[PDB]
Write a protein that binds this ligand. Structure first.
Ligand SMILES: [Ca+2]
Ligand SMILES: [Ca+2]
Lengths: 474, 475
């Protein structure tokens, strides 16, 4: 079978098929209903490079030294020889490996000395929906230079990363969207959210167009497709953080031989996609691989999933998470750091951060919304996600949950030792200072293009954000 | 031919005891004033280092010589126009050797030269101990070894009273007793910062006493005339960089040979008048191009007005001009849409009261007078009756009872700009503006991280830092 990994950016379970109001996602809904829809799939981290380094190797990024977003780009650090890329396994089974889709990035926090792919095509701005992915160089090279070989293709879209784009074919009514309780119920929040869902509608159209191309090529009879987000949506407490908003992603498995109308509620981590793919194409998974096979007779159930947060751009941190089907455990190794520690990306791109800072100063946030704006953090957080799906009622200090807290604390310690978590080793001063310098130059370049002061007050910034949203179309 | 000293203090308003300032102890500067001529109406032509100093070293407004942007023309082949001489070129012509002395070994010119500004030299500020021995440093040692047969012109630059302010633990000032202008909040943060400013004045007063004892022992004082003056007004939020009297009005004392004691002068003097007056004292004619007036002696020429300007200040772009007679201040903001509180890294990094006022403004706690600086835009014209409004907080420009005075001063500014061919009316290049905007906004992010602070820190969080900073300073 050919294998496709169709990777969406920065998206939570916000498709219509997952129960989300107002959004129109017919093509992804149809793929889900025609195959298996997963309700408990989790990335191992909540930004691009660490989620993607992980799922392309079947290993948590912390196990392979890739835990800092970004790092090891040009310093002679190579993936350890025992750790193979997905494409090395597929090459062994006779596959040709293709990098397709507008996002021609691997986002690895390491170099390699063999190519990750055999052929490739080449704030983001999303390209028109009428893209013809199969007429670009990766696919053209495949069909012309390779005969009788199955393909493994990673197809990366830029949606739904910011900047969000309007969908004037089916515009979304901001007053009707469902907002998590940890953002303010406010016009700014809802307009930004409406554009997020309209960006999902835009990529949904693109997925429909891809499948039209694939059917026309005649490859849909012997192709299995994994569709999944790299991590959760680009909203303030979701992306970069280890709550369900940052970790839980759509995951659909589809193709001839995959029975339709299945819904799966078992724990899956994105590092499971590689071993499951190997198993699907007849390969044994090496013992070193941390991911589990989640489909077929060889599946291995999980008791837990795990995730990490280490440096993110210039913002240093050290956070770990353990989740079973019911409980989320989070450990902040640096409790003295605020959650809202300076991050240029969040301040530059997220109108709701300005909104919440403005409202926090005026004492207008709800109790649940204000938790993110405390000056420091509890060392441990424990959430009963059955009774508290938005993870705003920390149970870690409630002695009635202490046995559960200690179980999960102990599991995190066991896991860190078994995987030799490399995020426990500080980065060098030269590296941290480099990225401090990098994101000061980026911040100021971007704030300059807007004519705003680097020290702009939240209320003045909101004037800008209202105009920005109006120009986006909401 | 008498020796000439220009003793230049940094960033200081009329805040000496002899000018009527409570609590501060300035016995040495007081005595110098009382032993000579004290000037009550001396004004810089700009309110930051390079533009005021480029001006007083040439007798020309900085705008007349292309030096109006602080800083600029450091390394681009821009030279002082050949008709414009530096003070030291005139003094060289009269047989003087020119000495650059004091801890601040800088000229701060917004232009290059092809002739040295001085003949001998020694070599956030941190102020050196009061026991400094300026005559034991290389400028004076060179003078006495190589040129003792010539009269000297010396510019002696102190670092006080620029920030960071330094505590004076020998005569500590009680913050609860200092006199604060009405446009800053009567608040502990304001008063602690202000007490340290006044203790920094006390520190430089001690140094000035030590300098005069050393000059006396050197045997040169009998044949020396000394001009003591600030380069512009005090390093407080609405004073330095701005064209209110807090930014422009400076101590000025003339003392020594031929200078009769116990004289007080209430006439308009601009710092560009110091050079022509010095030329006249040493027996030179002043060329007609010089914009400064001789203010002392038989050739004195009275002023009707003084003038000042504000153009780019570090990264902050602006265009402001001022005209002042003895009574009225006129200020024209050429870019009224810009707020007064346009981002300036220096003010945000160095001024605790900026964080205090931003915090208080957000809580609606500033008085009406204090809130004027925090408006989102400016009136194109400001007019103040300084006799009745010495803090310049009651703008009369929209009061038709003062329109004749407004139009008189408006017209004088236009006349002056046309007569002097004001170069600040010509935009700087994009390459220059972008260079400095980057340079300083980088500096802001850098120093904020070094203090462990976010560049977007709230004013109230910044005030937690500023309290600890003041405590570490000693107040
Ligand atoms: Ca992503
Ligand atoms: Ca100065």
């Amino acid at each position: 079978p050919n294998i496709i990994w169709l990777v969406l950016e920065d998206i939570s379970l916000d498709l219509s098929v997952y129960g989300t109001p107002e959004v129109k996602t017919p093509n992804l809904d149809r793929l889900a209903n025609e195959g298996i829809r997963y309700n408990h799939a989790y990335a191992t981290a909540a930004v691009c490079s660490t989620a993607r380094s992980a799922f392309f190797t079947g290993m948590h990024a912390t196990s392979i030294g890739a835990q800092n977003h970004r790092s090891h780009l040009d310093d002679g650090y190579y993936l350890p020889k025992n750790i193979k890329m997905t494409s090395q396994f597929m090459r062994e089974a006779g596959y040709v490996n293709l990098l397709m889709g507008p996002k021609q990035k691997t986002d690895f926090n390491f170099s390699t000395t063999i190519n990750a792919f055999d052929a490739q095509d080449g704030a983001y701005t999303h390209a028109p929906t009428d893209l013809k992915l199969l007429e670009r160089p990766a696919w053209q090279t495949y069909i012309k230079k390779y005969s009788g070989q199955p393909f493994f293709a990673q197809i990366n879209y830029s949606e739904t990363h910011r900047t969000f784009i309007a969908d004037k074919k089916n515009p979304i009514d901001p007053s009707k969207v469902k907002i998590p309780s940890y953002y303010p119920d406010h016009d700014i929040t809802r307009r930004d959210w409406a554009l997020y869902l309209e960006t999902i509608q835009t990529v949904d159209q693109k997925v429909g167009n891809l499948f039209s191309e694939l059917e026309k090529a005649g490859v849909l009879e012997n192709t299995i497709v994994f569709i999944f987000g790299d991590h959760g949506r680009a909203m303030l407490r979701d992306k970069q953080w280890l709550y369900d908003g940052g970790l839980r992603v759509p995951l659909i498995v589809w193709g001839k031989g995959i029975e339709s109308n299945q819904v799966n509620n078992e724990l899956v981590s994105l590092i499971d996609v590689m071993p499951t793919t190997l198993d699907l194409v007849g390969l044994k998974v090496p013992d070193y691989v941390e991911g589990h096979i989640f489909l077929g007779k060889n599946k291995q159930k999980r008791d837990y999933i795990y995730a990490h947060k280490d440096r993110t751009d210039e913002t240093d941190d050290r956070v770990r998470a353990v989740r079973n089907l019911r409980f989320k455990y989070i450990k902040n190794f640096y409790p003295e750091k605020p959650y809202n520690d300076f991050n240029a990306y969040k301040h530059l791109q997220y109108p709701v951060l300005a909104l919440m800072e403005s409202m926090h100063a005026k004492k207008l946030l709800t109790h649940e919304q204000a938790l993110f704006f405390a000056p420091n953090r509890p060392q441990e957080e424990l959430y009963d996600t059955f009774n508290d799906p938005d993870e705003v009622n920390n149970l870690a200090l409630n002695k009635n949950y202490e046995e559960q807290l200690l179980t999960m604390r102990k599991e995190l310690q066991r896991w860190q030792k078994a995987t030799n978590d490399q995020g426990m080793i500080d980065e060098t001063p030269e590296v941290k200072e480099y990225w401090d310098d990098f994101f000061k130059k980026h911040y100021l370049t971007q704030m300059r293009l807007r004519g705003l002061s680097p020290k702009i007050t939240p209320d003045d910034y909101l004037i800008f954000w209202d105009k920005f949203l109006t120009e986006q179309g909401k």
